[PDB]
Amino acid sequence: GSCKGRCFELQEVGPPDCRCDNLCKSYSSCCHDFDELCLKTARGWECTKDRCGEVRNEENACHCSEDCLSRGDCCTNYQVVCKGESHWVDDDCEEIKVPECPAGFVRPPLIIFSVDGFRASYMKKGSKVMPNIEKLRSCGTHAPYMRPVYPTKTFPNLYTLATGLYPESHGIVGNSMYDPVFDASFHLRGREKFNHRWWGGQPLWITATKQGVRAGTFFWSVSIPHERRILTILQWLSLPDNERPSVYAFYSEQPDFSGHKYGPFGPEMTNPLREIDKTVGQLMDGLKQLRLHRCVNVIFVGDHGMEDVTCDRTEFLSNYLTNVDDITLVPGTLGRIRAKSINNSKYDPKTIIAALTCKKPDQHFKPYMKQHLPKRLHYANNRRIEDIHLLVDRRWHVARKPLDVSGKCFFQGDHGFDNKVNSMQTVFVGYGPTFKYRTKVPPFENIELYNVMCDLLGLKPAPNNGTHGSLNHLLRTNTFRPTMPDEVSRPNYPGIMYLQSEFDLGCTCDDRLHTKGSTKERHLLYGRPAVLYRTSYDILYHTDFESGYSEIFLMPLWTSYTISKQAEVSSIPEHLTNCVRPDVRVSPGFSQNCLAYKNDKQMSYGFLFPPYLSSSPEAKYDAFLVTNMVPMYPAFKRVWAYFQRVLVKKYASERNGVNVISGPIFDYNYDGLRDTEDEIKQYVEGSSIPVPTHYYSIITSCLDFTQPADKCDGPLSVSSFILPHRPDNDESCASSEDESKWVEELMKMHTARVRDIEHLTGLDFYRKTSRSYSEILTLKTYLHTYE
Ligand SMILES: CCc1nc2c(C)cc(N3CCN(CC(=O)N4CC(O)C4)CC3)cn2c1N(C)c1nc(-c2ccc(F)cc2)c(C#N)s1
Ligand SMILES: *[C@@H]1O[C@H](CO)[C@@H](O)[C@H](O)[C@H]1NC(C)=O
Ligand SMILES: [Ca+2]
Ligand code: NA
Ligand SMILES: [Zn+2]
Ligand SMILES: [Zn+2]
């Protein structure tokens, strides 16, 4: 009927009965008077000196009367101009040791101020452009930058913040999407983006509601101005205890729009950032009028950054593919290719990949079968993600035909590139009681934030991709303390059993031995990795390395070893080139056969521990054990040999020694999780030897580089890779030249976290350290970007 006193109501209303909520416009189910009651614009948003001590006029946008505080619907600057109060920004920065909330408040509220396309380097502008945001950043907990998820677009990142999930998990994989099961398209413009079926996981507002914690609107109907959104949140905070929600969200479309139109480094970006700051100023002043400015948790977060991208810097598939009218492309800062129609038979992914692979010297994109995309992107396991994907170089675009892209140039900026690119990095600020005071924190991924916001609201988080405890160093008080998971599979330590005579593996070499002593104290600085799944594996000790050999996979799950700064690098002797010796501690049955590698013309082998960095000539013979070999393509051996021969020593030289934990990964269903035996598709020809899809390497050192890797009492420094086990090096366009030119570039592109490896290996590292477990969780979430 009417929105008499029901403006922006938080309850549900079953059809009919016209609703007056924040989504009534988008479905067009608002009452006739909604606009002339709830969207009042009369006499602006700011109180004036001549409006102070006025009688209540209901038509006014915000009130400047005496009862406005009791009513809880004043203008944000009411007390400042009338009661002679100061702006929140003008006040001296004061530590919030305890939440200062009125009686009735059971928990301190949470305000999420999300800013679309907010570049991390905009904070450099400082108090001159953004005085209010500078105060929040300087006073509360802030990071130099926050890492978004790929693709670095609005919808995937905002819903990643909401759910703590990778876009492939929560299902919003882009602003543009096609689902083959629905046979419908999701777009930035359309009614289909309001359909619930597209949205997966459990966002913060659902988690809160189902645990008895009431939540305000997270979406605002497009035609509700920024000033009204702030006033509506401040009105909700004035509601009684039983009706008042504890979690709110504000979303601004700036400075994205101005970022696209003018560019990141544009002088026209100042005003849009002044505008954002004023909106924040209205909130903080508004909270101060309600006496909630030292009660409420404020998160100032962005979804992504912005890069200099021009229309003249565009690649066209018409200069690669002969028939362009056969494929549908999702163009711009990324590429997703599928068939235009399902009726087409000639459509071959293999031919399209080949045609797009290193054709031009200065090619500004690289084609990938989604399973071959870097694992750190976690962008494959979803039916809305197309098999063919193009990773576009920063500052560049990819279109189907030249006529697709348009005038002189409409856009000078864009986003959606690799999430490790500096220009795509966004902001996080945490102001309030539960957050720390004048505290800088290392950069972290936005996937982690859902866990933190749940902790602020005292909620049990839904199973997500955040490492719970990794952001405990953000908070003054922690409601969750993390615990190491219990080991499921206890290790075996098998002695000498089977004699060289019994081993008929079809092998040859042409040529105590295996004991513990310094093997643990030197080559396990951070303890034995725990196996978190039922499987039979053995602990094998050597003088140079220690490994956890699997009897099911017939190879090590992990191989740990340590190289000092003054460590020697020797060559593989010519008379030990094809040397592969049987391990007396393991049975012939639970061992690889060298015959299988001769039958398989495509598959060679390599060693997890390098013979190159053997302590003595006698110790090098331990490197040629059958329990230290893994199936490897000749193409990959070029990458792995260089790493082991050159780079493993190079790191030890610069990082004053390094501990290396190397091993295989099986992920044929590309879900980023450890494969079971049945899920392995490819084995070595005529054998039960499973072919790893990737090979990982956890390279740990001392943060204080003055101290060596062993005898490091201070914090730890870590870098990790997950190199794809490819039968070719087509990913590397310069693979023709010496390994030094290309191999290192490939590794930095396939950089990874420890958590990424732990998910893919089902292992748990850094179990015996001098560090707190929450500090280790941060070390495990750390990603070396090389930017
Ligand atoms: C481009 C901005 C935007 N536009 C929309 C639109 C049109 C709809 C929309 N949704 C998403 C939620 N969905 C209904 C819903 O409650 N659920 C479907 C799930 O099962 C739970 C459909 C409506 C989110 N939108 C968003 N997003 C992603 C927003 N970000 C947030 C957000 C996310 C995290 C934050 F920390 C703060 C704000 C919003 C919310 N709610 S508004
Ligand atoms: C992300 O979280 C979801 C839900 O817990 C899970 O299904 C998925 O496997 C997780 N991803 C990884 C890489 O662990
Ligand atoms: Ca898997
Ligand atoms: Na090549
Ligand atoms: Zn955005
Ligand atoms: Zn944008």
Short mmCIF file of N, CA, C and O in Angstrom, two decimals, residues 626-702:
data_model
loop_
_atom_site.label_atom_id
_atom_site.label_comp_id
_atom_site.label_asym_id
_atom_site.label_seq_id
_atom_site.Cartn_x
_atom_site.Cartn_y
_atom_site.Cartn_z
N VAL A 626 66.34 -45.71 -6.84
CA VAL A 626 65.05 -45.93 -7.58
C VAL A 626 63.91 -45.26 -6.81
O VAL A 626 62.86 -45.00 -7.43
N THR A 627 64.09 -45.00 -5.51
CA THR A 627 63.10 -44.34 -4.61
C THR A 627 63.29 -42.82 -4.63
O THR A 627 62.58 -42.15 -3.86
N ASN A 628 64.20 -42.30 -5.46
CA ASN A 628 64.48 -40.84 -5.60
C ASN A 628 64.28 -40.40 -7.06
O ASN A 628 64.67 -39.26 -7.38
N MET A 629 63.68 -41.25 -7.91
CA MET A 629 63.41 -40.95 -9.34
C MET A 629 61.91 -40.76 -9.54
O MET A 629 61.12 -41.39 -8.81
N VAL A 630 61.53 -39.91 -10.50
CA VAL A 630 60.11 -39.54 -10.82
C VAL A 630 59.95 -39.42 -12.33
O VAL A 630 60.88 -38.97 -13.01
N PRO A 631 58.79 -39.81 -12.91
CA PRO A 631 58.58 -39.73 -14.36
C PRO A 631 58.60 -38.27 -14.86
O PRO A 631 57.85 -37.47 -14.32
N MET A 632 59.42 -37.98 -15.87
CA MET A 632 59.63 -36.60 -16.39
C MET A 632 59.84 -36.63 -17.91
O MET A 632 60.62 -37.47 -18.39
N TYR A 633 59.16 -35.73 -18.63
CA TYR A 633 59.29 -35.52 -20.10
C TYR A 633 60.65 -34.88 -20.39
O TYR A 633 61.13 -34.08 -19.60
N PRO A 634 61.31 -35.22 -21.53
CA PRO A 634 62.55 -34.54 -21.92
C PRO A 634 62.42 -33.01 -21.92
O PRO A 634 63.35 -32.36 -21.48
N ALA A 635 61.29 -32.49 -22.40
CA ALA A 635 60.96 -31.05 -22.45
C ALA A 635 61.04 -30.44 -21.04
O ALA A 635 61.56 -29.31 -20.92
N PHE A 636 60.54 -31.15 -20.03
CA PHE A 636 60.50 -30.70 -18.61
C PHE A 636 61.87 -30.85 -17.96
O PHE A 636 62.22 -30.00 -17.12
N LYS A 637 62.62 -31.90 -18.32
CA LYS A 637 63.99 -32.18 -17.78
C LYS A 637 64.90 -30.97 -18.00
O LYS A 637 65.75 -30.72 -17.13
N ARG A 638 64.71 -30.24 -19.11
CA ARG A 638 65.44 -28.98 -19.43
C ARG A 638 65.18 -27.93 -18.35
O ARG A 638 66.14 -27.23 -17.96
N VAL A 639 63.94 -27.82 -17.88
CA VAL A 639 63.50 -26.84 -16.84
C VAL A 639 64.05 -27.30 -15.48
O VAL A 639 64.66 -26.47 -14.78
N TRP A 640 63.84 -28.58 -15.14
CA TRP A 640 64.16 -29.17 -13.81
C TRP A 640 65.68 -29.26 -13.61
O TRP A 640 66.13 -28.96 -12.49
N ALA A 641 66.42 -29.66 -14.65
CA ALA A 641 67.90 -29.80 -14.63
C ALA A 641 68.54 -28.45 -14.31
O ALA A 641 69.44 -28.41 -13.45
N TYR A 642 68.09 -27.38 -14.98
CA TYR A 642 68.61 -26.00 -14.83
C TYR A 642 68.39 -25.52 -13.39
O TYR A 642 69.36 -25.09 -12.74
N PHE A 643 67.14 -25.60 -12.92
CA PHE A 643 66.72 -25.27 -11.53
C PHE A 643 67.71 -25.89 -10.54
O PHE A 643 68.32 -25.15 -9.75
N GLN A 644 67.87 -27.22 -10.61
CA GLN A 644 68.71 -28.03 -9.69
C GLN A 644 70.19 -27.68 -9.87
O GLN A 644 70.86 -27.45 -8.84
N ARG A 645 70.67 -27.63 -11.11
CA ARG A 645 72.11 -27.45 -11.46
C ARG A 645 72.56 -26.02 -11.14
O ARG A 645 73.70 -25.88 -10.64
N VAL A 646 71.72 -25.02 -11.41
CA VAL A 646 72.10 -23.57 -11.39
C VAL A 646 71.39 -22.85 -10.23
O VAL A 646 72.09 -22.36 -9.33
N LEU A 647 70.05 -22.80 -10.26
CA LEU A 647 69.23 -21.86 -9.44
C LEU A 647 69.25 -22.24 -7.96
O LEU A 647 69.30 -21.32 -7.12
N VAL A 648 69.21 -23.54 -7.63
CA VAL A 648 69.19 -24.04 -6.22
C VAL A 648 70.46 -23.55 -5.50
O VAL A 648 70.36 -23.22 -4.30
N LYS A 649 71.59 -23.51 -6.21
CA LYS A 649 72.88 -22.95 -5.70
C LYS A 649 72.80 -21.42 -5.67
O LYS A 649 73.28 -20.82 -4.70
N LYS A 650 72.22 -20.82 -6.72
CA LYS A 650 72.08 -19.35 -6.88
C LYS A 650 71.31 -18.77 -5.68
O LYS A 650 71.73 -17.71 -5.18
N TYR A 651 70.24 -19.44 -5.24
CA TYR A 651 69.40 -19.03 -4.09
C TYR A 651 70.23 -19.14 -2.80
O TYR A 651 70.23 -18.18 -2.01
N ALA A 652 70.91 -20.28 -2.61
CA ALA A 652 71.77 -20.58 -1.44
C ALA A 652 72.86 -19.52 -1.29
O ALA A 652 73.21 -19.18 -0.14
N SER A 653 73.39 -19.01 -2.41
CA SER A 653 74.44 -17.96 -2.47
C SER A 653 73.90 -16.63 -1.94
O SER A 653 74.61 -15.98 -1.13
N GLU A 654 72.69 -16.24 -2.36
CA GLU A 654 72.07 -14.91 -2.08
C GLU A 654 71.34 -14.94 -0.74
O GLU A 654 71.43 -13.93 0.00
N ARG A 655 70.64 -16.03 -0.42
CA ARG A 655 69.78 -16.18 0.78
C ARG A 655 70.55 -16.86 1.92
O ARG A 655 69.89 -17.32 2.88
N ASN A 656 71.88 -16.91 1.83
CA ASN A 656 72.79 -17.49 2.86
C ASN A 656 72.31 -18.90 3.23
O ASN A 656 72.04 -19.15 4.42
N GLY A 657 72.19 -19.77 2.23
CA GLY A 657 71.72 -21.16 2.38
C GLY A 657 70.20 -21.26 2.31
O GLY A 657 69.53 -20.28 2.71
N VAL A 658 69.68 -22.39 1.82
CA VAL A 658 68.22 -22.63 1.63
C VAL A 658 67.90 -24.10 1.91
O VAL A 658 68.75 -24.96 1.61
N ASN A 659 66.72 -24.36 2.48
CA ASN A 659 66.13 -25.72 2.64
C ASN A 659 65.08 -25.92 1.54
O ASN A 659 64.18 -25.06 1.42
N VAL A 660 65.20 -27.00 0.77
CA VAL A 660 64.35 -27.30 -0.42
C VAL A 660 63.53 -28.56 -0.15
O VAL A 660 64.14 -29.62 0.07
N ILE A 661 62.20 -28.44 -0.15
CA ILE A 661 61.23 -29.58 -0.08
C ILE A 661 60.56 -29.71 -1.45
O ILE A 661 59.63 -28.93 -1.73
N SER A 662 61.03 -30.65 -2.28
CA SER A 662 60.52 -30.93 -3.65
C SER A 662 59.71 -32.22 -3.65
O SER A 662 59.95 -33.08 -2.78
N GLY A 663 58.79 -32.36 -4.61
CA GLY A 663 57.92 -33.55 -4.77
C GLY A 663 56.95 -33.40 -5.94
O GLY A 663 56.86 -32.33 -6.55
N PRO A 664 56.19 -34.46 -6.28
CA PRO A 664 55.22 -34.42 -7.36
C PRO A 664 53.82 -33.95 -6.91
O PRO A 664 53.55 -33.97 -5.72
N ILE A 665 52.99 -33.55 -7.88
CA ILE A 665 51.54 -33.23 -7.68
C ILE A 665 50.74 -33.93 -8.79
O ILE A 665 51.19 -33.91 -9.95
N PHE A 666 49.60 -34.53 -8.42
CA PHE A 666 48.62 -35.16 -9.34
C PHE A 666 47.29 -34.40 -9.22
O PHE A 666 46.71 -34.38 -8.12
N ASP A 667 46.85 -33.77 -10.32
CA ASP A 667 45.62 -32.93 -10.36
C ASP A 667 45.05 -32.95 -11.78
O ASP A 667 45.06 -31.89 -12.45
N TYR A 668 44.55 -34.11 -12.22
CA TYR A 668 44.02 -34.36 -13.59
C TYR A 668 42.62 -33.75 -13.73
O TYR A 668 42.25 -33.40 -14.87
N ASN A 669 41.87 -33.63 -12.63
CA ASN A 669 40.51 -33.02 -12.58
C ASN A 669 40.63 -31.53 -12.23
O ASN A 669 39.57 -30.89 -12.04
N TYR A 670 41.86 -31.00 -12.14
CA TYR A 670 42.21 -29.56 -11.99
C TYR A 670 41.26 -28.87 -11.01
O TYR A 670 40.75 -27.78 -11.33
N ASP A 671 41.07 -29.45 -9.82
CA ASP A 671 40.24 -28.88 -8.72
C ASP A 671 41.15 -28.27 -7.65
O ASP A 671 40.61 -27.77 -6.64
N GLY A 672 42.47 -28.30 -7.86
CA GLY A 672 43.48 -27.74 -6.93
C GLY A 672 43.63 -28.58 -5.67
O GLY A 672 44.25 -28.07 -4.71
N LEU A 673 43.10 -29.80 -5.67
CA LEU A 673 43.15 -30.75 -4.52
C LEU A 673 43.95 -32.00 -4.92
O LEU A 673 44.02 -32.28 -6.14
N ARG A 674 44.51 -32.70 -3.94
CA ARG A 674 45.27 -33.97 -4.12
C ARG A 674 44.37 -35.02 -4.78
O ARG A 674 43.26 -35.25 -4.26
N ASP A 675 44.83 -35.61 -5.89
CA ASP A 675 44.11 -36.69 -6.62
C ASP A 675 44.23 -38.00 -5.84
O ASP A 675 45.32 -38.27 -5.29
N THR A 676 43.14 -38.77 -5.80
CA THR A 676 43.13 -40.20 -5.38
C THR A 676 43.64 -41.04 -6.56
O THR A 676 43.70 -40.49 -7.68
N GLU A 677 43.98 -42.31 -6.32
CA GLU A 677 44.62 -43.21 -7.32
C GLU A 677 43.72 -43.35 -8.56
O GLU A 677 44.26 -43.39 -9.68
N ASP A 678 42.39 -43.40 -8.36
CA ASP A 678 41.38 -43.62 -9.43
C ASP A 678 41.28 -42.39 -10.34
O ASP A 678 40.90 -42.57 -11.51
N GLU A 679 41.60 -41.20 -9.82
CA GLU A 679 41.45 -39.90 -10.53
C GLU A 679 42.65 -39.65 -11.46
O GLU A 679 42.57 -38.70 -12.26
N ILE A 680 43.71 -40.46 -11.36
CA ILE A 680 44.92 -40.38 -12.23
C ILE A 680 44.58 -41.02 -13.58
O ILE A 680 44.26 -42.22 -13.60
N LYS A 681 44.65 -40.23 -14.67
CA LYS A 681 44.22 -40.62 -16.04
C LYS A 681 45.40 -41.25 -16.80
O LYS A 681 45.17 -42.27 -17.48
N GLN A 682 46.59 -40.65 -16.70
CA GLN A 682 47.81 -41.06 -17.44
C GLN A 682 48.78 -41.78 -16.49
O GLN A 682 49.08 -41.22 -15.42
N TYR A 683 49.24 -42.97 -16.90
CA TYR A 683 50.34 -43.74 -16.26
C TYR A 683 51.46 -43.93 -17.29
O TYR A 683 51.21 -43.72 -18.49
N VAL A 684 52.66 -44.31 -16.83
CA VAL A 684 53.82 -44.64 -17.71
C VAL A 684 53.47 -45.91 -18.49
O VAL A 684 52.95 -46.86 -17.86
N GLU A 685 53.71 -45.91 -19.81
CA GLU A 685 53.27 -46.96 -20.77
C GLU A 685 53.54 -48.35 -20.19
O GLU A 685 54.71 -48.66 -19.89
N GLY A 686 52.48 -49.15 -20.03
CA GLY A 686 52.53 -50.56 -19.59
C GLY A 686 53.13 -50.71 -18.20
O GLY A 686 54.01 -51.58 -18.03
N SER A 687 52.67 -49.90 -17.24
CA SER A 687 53.12 -49.93 -15.82
C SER A 687 52.05 -49.29 -14.93
O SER A 687 51.07 -48.73 -15.47
N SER A 688 52.23 -49.39 -13.61
CA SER A 688 51.35 -48.80 -12.56
C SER A 688 52.02 -47.58 -11.92
O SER A 688 51.74 -47.31 -10.74
N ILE A 689 52.86 -46.88 -12.68
CA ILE A 689 53.59 -45.65 -12.25
C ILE A 689 52.78 -44.43 -12.68
O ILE A 689 52.67 -44.15 -13.87
N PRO A 690 52.17 -43.68 -11.73
CA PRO A 690 51.36 -42.51 -12.08
C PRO A 690 52.24 -41.32 -12.50
O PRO A 690 53.27 -41.11 -11.89
N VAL A 691 51.80 -40.57 -13.52
CA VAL A 691 52.53 -39.40 -14.10
C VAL A 691 52.06 -38.13 -13.38
O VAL A 691 50.91 -37.73 -13.52
N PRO A 692 52.93 -37.47 -12.59
CA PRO A 692 52.59 -36.19 -11.97
C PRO A 692 52.22 -35.12 -13.02
O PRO A 692 52.85 -35.08 -14.06
N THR A 693 51.21 -34.30 -12.72
CA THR A 693 50.74 -33.17 -13.57
C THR A 693 51.62 -31.94 -13.30
O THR A 693 51.73 -31.09 -14.21
N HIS A 694 52.21 -31.85 -12.10
CA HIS A 694 53.09 -30.73 -11.66
C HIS A 694 54.20 -31.27 -10.74
O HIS A 694 54.06 -32.40 -10.24
N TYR A 695 55.25 -30.47 -10.54
CA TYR A 695 56.33 -30.69 -9.54
C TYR A 695 56.53 -29.41 -8.72
O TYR A 695 56.80 -28.36 -9.33
N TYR A 696 56.38 -29.50 -7.40
CA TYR A 696 56.50 -28.36 -6.45
C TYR A 696 57.91 -28.30 -5.88
O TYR A 696 58.67 -29.28 -6.01
N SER A 697 58.25 -27.16 -5.25
CA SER A 697 59.53 -26.92 -4.53
C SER A 697 59.33 -25.80 -3.51
O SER A 697 59.16 -24.64 -3.94
N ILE A 698 59.35 -26.13 -2.22
CA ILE A 698 59.26 -25.15 -1.09
C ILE A 698 60.69 -24.80 -0.66
O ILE A 698 61.32 -25.62 0.04
N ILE A 699 61.18 -23.63 -1.08
CA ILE A 699 62.56 -23.12 -0.80
C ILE A 699 62.48 -22.14 0.38
O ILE A 699 62.09 -20.98 0.16
N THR A 700 62.85 -22.60 1.58
CA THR A 700 62.81 -21.81 2.85
C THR A 700 64.21 -21.32 3.20
O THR A 700 65.19 -22.02 2.87
N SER A 701 64.29 -20.17 3.87
CA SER A 701 65.54 -19.54 4.37
C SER A 701 65.22 -18.68 5.61
O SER A 701 64.03 -18.63 5.99
N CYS A 702 66.24 -18.05 6.19
CA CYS A 702 66.11 -17.11 7.34
C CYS A 702 65.83 -15.70 6.80
O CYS A 702 66.56 -15.26 5.90
#
